Amino acid sequence: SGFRKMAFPSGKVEGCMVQVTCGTTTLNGLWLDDTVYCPRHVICTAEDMLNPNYEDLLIRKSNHSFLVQAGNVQLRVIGHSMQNCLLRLKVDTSNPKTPKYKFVRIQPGQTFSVLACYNGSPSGVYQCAMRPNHTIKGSFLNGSCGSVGFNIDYDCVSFCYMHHMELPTGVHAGTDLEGKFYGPFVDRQTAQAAGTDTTITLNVLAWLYAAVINGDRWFLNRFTTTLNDFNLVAMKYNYEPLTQDHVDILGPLSAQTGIAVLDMCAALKELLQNGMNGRTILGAAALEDEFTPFDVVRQCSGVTFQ
Amino acid sequence: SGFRKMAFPSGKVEGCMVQVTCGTTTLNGLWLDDTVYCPRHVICTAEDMLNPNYEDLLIRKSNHSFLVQAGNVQLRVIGHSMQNCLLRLKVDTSNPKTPKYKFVRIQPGQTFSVLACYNGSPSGVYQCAMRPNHTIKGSFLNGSCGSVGFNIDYDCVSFCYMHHMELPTGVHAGTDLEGKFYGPFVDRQTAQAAGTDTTITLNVLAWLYAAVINGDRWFLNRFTTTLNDFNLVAMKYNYEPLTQDHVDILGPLSAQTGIAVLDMCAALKELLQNGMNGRTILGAAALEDEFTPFDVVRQCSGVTFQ
């Protein structure tokens, strides 16, 4: 029983974190096999950031311009390329701790674990979601650049995020592990701001199913609804429209609770229209949208509470 | 910026988890040096649990009664004792991955990371608090017994919890690493239930300070209050009384925000009396009590947002 924001065990990833220094800037890198991946802005000075030309800045550097430390040991750099907004440093040593891994570009609404690091030392781990506006609502301080996000499937680490920057609203922006940004953001100092966000409807519904599997059905009602009718309500409350695809996804959860997806949607619209009346769901006072349907099945009993 | 329920990196602990089987029951154990620690109810049958005599049940077993697996490797048991509600199995191999560690008995209101495990394989990590009623609000399914709770200080793992059981309300109960239960609970099947709980006032206040450090002060007011006056309000709302000790603890946070502790208390009572008026704090719709003051300084900037 119970339900919590659960992160994946971070061990396989801790073994990959290193420190990367170039001139006066130090940040975190990811050491897999004989390559270290980090944000390219490690080669910038404060004023560089105002309008960097990374191609121009990088040609001016050599292999010995970079200092990579793994714990107490310095790794020798013997090559370097820029891949999009990332640097790849070839090093003279293969990481003995390299887990089986892939690089995946995550979709909005999906969740992942973040291992926050400073100076190449893991400091904490937490779960978060890729917002519709392509930001994540993280917890990062200075020096966290290079921290990564990942999921774990069997023994395989799927790396999906590397942290680059914080936006004026205190939310965070970064790239996948090929250095392509999530969202319309760039790695330089500008007036860029998060676009307006929206609530992840599929996740909220998943979470309501979670509440039921865990023996709670107070918010339910006798009504059902049309996709179209639900979506008129969604618009008004800044929720993403529900699509037939999302209804299909909620299949398995619908079956194990015996609650038709569109009936759940009827409950959801009632909650949005009537508020929660000072009550809680899964201990929360407002609707939660950072659990996917996958997260729910991961963590919940395969047997519902009644 | 940002603020999240942050768990400690779980790597040092993952390296210690094993599987312990006795007869038909399998659960998790903790392998440090040449000892494996697990819940003693691993030696019970379903009906045994109704009224076990652990002394009587254990004398009937031998070293070869236990099967310990670490990944694919079976560890040979060569001794066994009961320490309170725990079993200690001496094994023929010292765990090469044993971190520097201590066993500490945590106090109510304090927080820790939980590594949820099944069949000796870590499945997820999350943060939680020891409730005043000595339970934790965890997320555990069948087979999670033996999962542990810990904090990390420098390189030293402080183990503070081992999971034994779930209570009728779906909250969880377990022991410290000497096998002494937190709370008035016992490891057998009975009508035991969680006592009534209360909100952790010191943590709520810490969290309000966190909101300020992060640039939010909407809930503040021009008033101050007496310890006594605050506590009359606390009683009515099922919050723990505030004590001079708690005011001292909130010192450092009070200094860096420039907000007198008792002024913060005035804000708190206003919030409790007036509700949040459909607004949020740190993104939450109700007051949060699972962050200690220590957690706040850990994760927040040492420089407040303005």
Side-chain angles (χ1 to χ4, degrees):
Chain A
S1 176
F3 205 75
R4 280 217 185 257
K5 288 270 175 58
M6 269 208 334
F8 283 108
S10 64
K12 290 184 170 54
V13 178
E14 301 168 41
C16 303
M17 301 310 298
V18 302
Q19 187 164 25
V20 186
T21 305
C22 186
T24 193
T25 300
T26 292
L27 49 62
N28 308 280
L30 189 66
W31 180 28
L32 307 162
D33 300 316
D34 60 24
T35 301
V36 168
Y37 307 74
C38 71
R40 68 189 182 164
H41 71 244
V42 67
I43 75 178
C44 294
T45 67
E47 78 175 325
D48 274 323
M49 288 305 292
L50 303 164
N51 197 27
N53 187 294
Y54 285 99
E55 304 74 29
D56 205 73
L57 294 165
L58 180 66
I59 197 76
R60 300 180 190 269
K61 306 218 136 35
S62 71
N63 286 341
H64 35 108
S65 308
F66 304 91
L67 167 69
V68 178
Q69 309 194 12
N72 305 328
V73 165
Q74 292 192 11
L75 299 184
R76 177 171 299 96
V77 174
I78 63 205
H80 61 262
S81 59
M82 182 162 62
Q83 197 189 2
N84 301 299
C85 299
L86 251 45
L87 288 192
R88 342 252 306 276
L89 312 184
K90 188 188 285 303
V91 288
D92 72 345
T93 302
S94 217
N95 184 353
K97 285 176 177 188
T98 305
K100 158 78 165 314
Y101 74 90
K102 334 185 164 187
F103 294 158
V104 306
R105 177 172 186 82
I106 226 65
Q107 298 297 133
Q110 302 197 287
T111 65
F112 53 99
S113 298
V114 175
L115 184 65
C117 300
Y118 302 80
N119 304 117
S121 316
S123 85
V125 55
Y126 56 87
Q127 192 72 350
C128 70
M130 175 62 56
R131 288 275 109 202
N133 70 7
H134 315 283
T135 65
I136 63 165
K137 289 184 174 173
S139 181
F140 288 111
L141 301 172
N142 288 322
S144 59
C145 295
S147 294
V148 311
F150 59 104
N151 285 292
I152 305 189
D153 308 74
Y154 51 98
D155 63 4
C156 182
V157 182
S158 282
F159 294 101
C160 64
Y161 180 86
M162 177 163 279
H163 180 54
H164 292 232
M165 61 194 271
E166 186 176 77
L167 297 167
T169 49
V171 299
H172 301 101
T175 65
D176 58 25
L177 270 288
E178 287 167 25
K180 158 53 187 164
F181 266 91
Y182 291 105
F185 312 112
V186 298
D187 53 351
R188 86 171 65 99
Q189 198 52 231
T190 67
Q192 62 197 154
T196 58
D197 198 17
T198 82
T199 295
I200 305 151
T201 307
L202 177 69
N203 288 358
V204 173
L205 287 165
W207 184 70
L208 294 179
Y209 274 113
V212 167
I213 300 176
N214 279 229
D216 193 352
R217 30 201 295 153
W218 74 258
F219 45 86
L220 297 184
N221 64 32
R222 68 178 172 99
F223 305 117
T224 193
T225 192
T226 290
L227 208 62
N228 179 73
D229 286 337
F230 176 79
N231 288 334
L232 287 179
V233 178
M235 279 197 84
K236 175 181 179 186
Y237 290 92
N238 193 19
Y239 268 60
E240 295 183 320
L242 197 66
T243 64
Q244 184 53 225
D245 282 8
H246 298 155
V247 175
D248 293 347
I249 285 167
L250 293 169
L253 287 169
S254 166
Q256 105 158 245
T257 49
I259 304 169
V261 173
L262 288 163
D263 295 354
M264 192 62 83
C265 291
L268 177 42
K269 61 195 292 178
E270 176 177 310
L271 284 167
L272 289 182
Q273 273 161 351
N274 303 344
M276 271 162 73
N277 193 47
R279 312 180 52 102
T280 68
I281 288 164
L282 250 12
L287 306 171
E288 174 68 44
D289 80 347
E290 301 206 348
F291 290 98
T292 60
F294 178 109
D295 295 354
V296 168
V297 314
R298 210 250 275 202
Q299 172 179 356
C300 276
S301 182
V303 174
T304 130
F305 186 22
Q306 81 64 238
Chain B
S1 176
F3 205 75
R4 280 217 185 257
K5 288 270 175 58
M6 269 208 334
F8 283 108
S10 64
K12 290 184 170 54
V13 178
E14 301 168 41
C16 303
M17 301 310 298
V18 302
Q19 187 164 25
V20 186
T21 305
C22 186
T24 193
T25 300
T26 292
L27 49 62
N28 308 280
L30 189 66
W31 180 28
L32 307 162
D33 300 316
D34 60 24
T35 301
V36 168
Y37 307 74
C38 71
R40 68 189 182 164
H41 71 244
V42 67
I43 75 178
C44 294
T45 67
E47 78 175 325
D48 274 323
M49 288 305 292
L50 303 164
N51 197 27
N53 187 294
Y54 285 99
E55 304 74 29
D56 205 73
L57 294 165
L58 180 66
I59 197 76
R60 300 180 190 269
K61 306 218 136 35
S62 71
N63 286 341
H64 35 108
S65 308
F66 304 91
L67 167 69
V68 178
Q69 309 194 12
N72 305 328
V73 165
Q74 292 192 11
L75 299 184
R76 177 171 299 96
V77 174
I78 63 205
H80 61 262
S81 59
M82 182 162 62
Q83 197 189 2
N84 301 299
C85 299
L86 251 45
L87 288 192
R88 342 252 306 276
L89 312 184
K90 188 188 285 303
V91 288
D92 72 345
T93 302
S94 217
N95 184 353
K97 285 176 177 188
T98 305
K100 158 78 165 314
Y101 74 90
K102 334 185 164 187
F103 294 158
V104 306
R105 177 172 186 82
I106 226 65
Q107 298 297 133
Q110 302 197 287
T111 65
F112 53 99
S113 298
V114 175
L115 184 65
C117 300
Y118 302 80
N119 304 117
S121 316
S123 85
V125 55
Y126 56 87
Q127 192 72 350
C128 70
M130 175 62 56
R131 288 275 109 202
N133 70 7
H134 315 283
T135 65
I136 63 165
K137 289 184 174 173
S139 181
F140 288 111
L141 301 172
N142 288 322
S144 59
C145 295
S147 294
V148 311
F150 59 104
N151 285 292
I152 305 189
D153 308 74
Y154 51 98
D155 63 4
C156 182
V157 182
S158 282
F159 294 101
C160 64
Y161 180 86
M162 177 163 279
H163 180 54
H164 292 232
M165 61 194 271
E166 186 176 77
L167 297 167
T169 49
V171 299
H172 301 101
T175 65
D176 58 25
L177 270 288
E178 287 167 25
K180 158 53 187 164
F181 266 91
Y182 291 105
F185 312 112
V186 298
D187 53 351
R188 86 171 65 99
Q189 198 52 231
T190 67
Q192 62 197 154
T196 58
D197 198 17
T198 82
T199 295
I200 305 151
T201 307
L202 177 69
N203 288 358
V204 173
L205 287 165
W207 184 70
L208 294 179
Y209 274 113
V212 167
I213 300 176
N214 279 229
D216 193 352
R217 30 201 295 153
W218 74 258
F219 45 86
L220 297 184
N221 64 32
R222 68 178 172 99
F223 305 117
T224 193
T225 192
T226 290
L227 208 62
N228 179 73
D229 286 337
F230 176 79
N231 288 334
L232 287 179
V233 178
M235 279 197 84
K236 175 181 179 186
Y237 290 92
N238 193 19
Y239 268 60
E240 295 183 320
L242 197 66
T243 64
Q244 184 53 225
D245 282 8
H246 298 155
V247 175
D248 293 347
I249 285 167
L250 293 169
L253 287 169
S254 166
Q256 105 158 245
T257 49
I259 304 169
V261 173
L262 288 163
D263 295 354
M264 192 62 83
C265 291
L268 177 42
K269 61 195 292 178
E270 176 177 310
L271 284 167
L272 289 182
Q273 273 161 351
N274 303 344
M276 271 162 73
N277 193 47
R279 312 180 52 102
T280 68
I281 288 164
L282 250 12
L287 306 171
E288 174 68 44
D289 80 347
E290 301 206 348
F291 290 98
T292 60
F294 178 109
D295 295 354
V296 168
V297 314
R298 210 250 275 202
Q299 172 179 356
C300 276
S301 182
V303 174
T304 130
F305 186 22
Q306 81 64 238

